[PDB]
């Protein structure tokens, strides 16, 4: 018996809003320690890594460690069905050729639960060790959200600049130029270097990344030259949410 | 005829033996105030069922019936 | 002349909106008894009662009967022009073949005049009679939408089965099956039941229903083995809106 | 060598709005009077014509007289690049075949910075008289758009028939015909300067194009005569104006 009750319905729907563009089918990784997803999106490209630790639930139980092959396109669509603040729980029996998914409406009064036929998956790993960053910057996550959604309108790829004076986020394209900057400080923005760093990334994925947003109200950027961009979302002290994307060769 | 409740008290009614349970039920709201759903009656260790008449099974005049309620 | 004069109007939208997208051309039976209508929509599927009582009106005049041909998505068309404030009037002059809409503003400054064509068309009645319902549910409107909604997602129709202590809702298709169930209390889900009952309903068409939700904070289903669905929605102290629909066997 | 600057640099955002459908490439005829733009639309059918004076503008600077080839859809999503509460600064070099937009957050820190490259400009100016007008309407603009929307769904072309008591807008199709009747009072302050009564016929296309410019002010005026093109004017407070003309329709 794999069960676990989340209280906050709403970080599930969203953590599917953040994955069903950017991957179709997916192996979650149910352990005893937590709920893992980890796939690259369906283009190869970005890596994405979800966390969800035991401790960040309210009721979680894993008996033998289950491998879940779900359609998140699917899985979200159910998700739809439920409220904001539902109360959410995910049941899976041990063979599990299918999932249940139980919402309960707060202060009750009112019950539904639904279940979905899973897929044959295998498994992703991709476990990236990975070190200390040169860069890392934590920024509201909307912010760079509309950076990303307006620098689109110039060029096909961001170049993100990081020294400790403040951050560049530049563009061009046929309609001409432009360049965001930040320069530092509840919110707004941090820096950490041992070093400086010029990196040119596609506004694409990033974009993608972004559907992530309602997540956190921080987001954090960790690049390091010849080391692929981390874009960070922390959840509730739950888990968290990380999109790997690797930066182009000639910024320039 | 008499009807008691589990409270040990029957009350008296006038129907006519050879009859149905249901307009008996009848009577039994007409001045207890009970739908004759919320409501079974037990006579002889058996649960009267809807539709027969008492000649099906042996009864004689002044006896007392059981009234017994169903669930909330 | 027939004359309607009605001074909240945000319900003739509304009724107009609960009927465009499932009746294309139907026939208002105007009368002392106030303004009718039953039809049967595009498909020939469901069927459809609205009631708007003369009484119900700040002021009717009807000096005799007629049988008013119309294009609902005109008449709706024409109506989004009005605001939701606005006192609707609503004037059909003898033998005529056209109606007059007066939106008035509150306030009295803007005041618009609209008058559009009508259809030679027929009455054709249908009426059920009427009948007593194993079981009726008496629940809020935007739940009963918000059901509808997230089911056809997971399928196309619905099995709705009601018993003395709560209401469910399923389906199923190849994503997968989901149940809702409401659970009488103990707005306020309500269950008047001498008997318990399931039926099966075409998904598209109860969806076409829910529609009718502005019209009223509360929604009832009425039905009975093999019997046509009711869906009631009460247009207050005026008449009121049911849709039936059969439902499927099995 | 010109920067202008606007605090309160929504107004240029909303002034694009009213604008990118209605025409694609403009030449803002820019002086040290002010910044200034007239075009007809994309058809030959309407006139437009925008003038914020340096009055407006936090800072002025133009040395050497400007006329500047811009697209206006492009320069539109350049701006979208700017918050409302966002402050902007226009900035151009003597020929300048590249504009460059620059955005400040009155939240300081987060700066943006754009430069559009311009085109070749054509030679434009237009034959507007600024006469007396038989009717002067003066209304909320968002009833003008209201009304213009509304009978949109009814009919083609709108009638405009302009009296002392009001102003009644009219119109029909193959569903009916409407009419709607507005008043004078007793912001708000619905008003008709009156000589000779008018009526004339609209079409309802370029006039929606026009309701477009609502958000720029809280009222419109609509200046009319007979045989001579509509006047709407939308019109930007403490700074300029935007007006648009149309031909009523012929006989």
Redesign the interface.
């Known amino acids: 018996m794999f069960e676990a009750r989340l209280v906050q319905g709403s970080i599930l729907k969203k953590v599917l809003e953040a994955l069903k563009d950017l991957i179709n089918e997916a192996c979650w990784d149910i352990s005893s320690s937590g709920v893992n997803l980890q796939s690259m999106d369906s283009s190869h490209v970005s890596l994405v890594q979800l966390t969800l630790r035991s401790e960040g639930f309210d009721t979680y139980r894993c008996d033998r460690n289950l491998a879940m092959g779900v359609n998140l396109t ?1 899985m979200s ?2 998700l ?2 439920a409220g904001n603040e539902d109360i959410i729980t995910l049941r899976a029996e041990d063979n599990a050729d ?1 999932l249940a998914l139980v919402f309960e409406a707060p202060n009750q ?9 899973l897929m044959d998956l295998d498994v992703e790993q991709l476990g990236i060790p990975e070190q200390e960053y040169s860069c890392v910057v934590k920024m509201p996550s909307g ?1 760079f959200a509309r950076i990303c959604r ?2 689109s ?2 060029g096909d790829a961001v170049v993100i600049s990081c020294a400790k004076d ?1 951050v560049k986020f530049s563009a061009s394209g046929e ?11 509840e919110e ?1 923005v941090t820096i950490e270097m041992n070093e400086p760093v010029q990196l040119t990334f596609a506004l694409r994925y990033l974009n993608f990344f972004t559907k992530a947003t309602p997540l956190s109200s921080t987001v954090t950027l960790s690049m390091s030259a010849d080391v692929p961009l981390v874009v960070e979302y922390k959840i509730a002290d739950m888990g968290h949410l990380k999109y790997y994307l690797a930066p182009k060769i000639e910024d320039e | 005829i008499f009807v008691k409740t589990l409270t040990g008290k029957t009350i008296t009614l006038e129907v006519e033996p050879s009859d149905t349970i249901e307009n008996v039920k009848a009577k039994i709201q007409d001045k207890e105030g009970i739908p004759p759903d919320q409501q079974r009656l037990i006579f002889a260790g058996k649960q009267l069922e809807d539709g027969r008449t008492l000649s099906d099974y042996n009864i004689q005049k002044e006896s007392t019936l059981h009234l017994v309620l169903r669930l909330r």
């Open positions: 699917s669509k159910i739809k069905c299918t009064e009112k019950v539904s639960d639904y279940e979905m036929k912010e307006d620098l309108h110039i403040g309609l001409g130029n432009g360049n965001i900057k930040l320069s530092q400080t707004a």
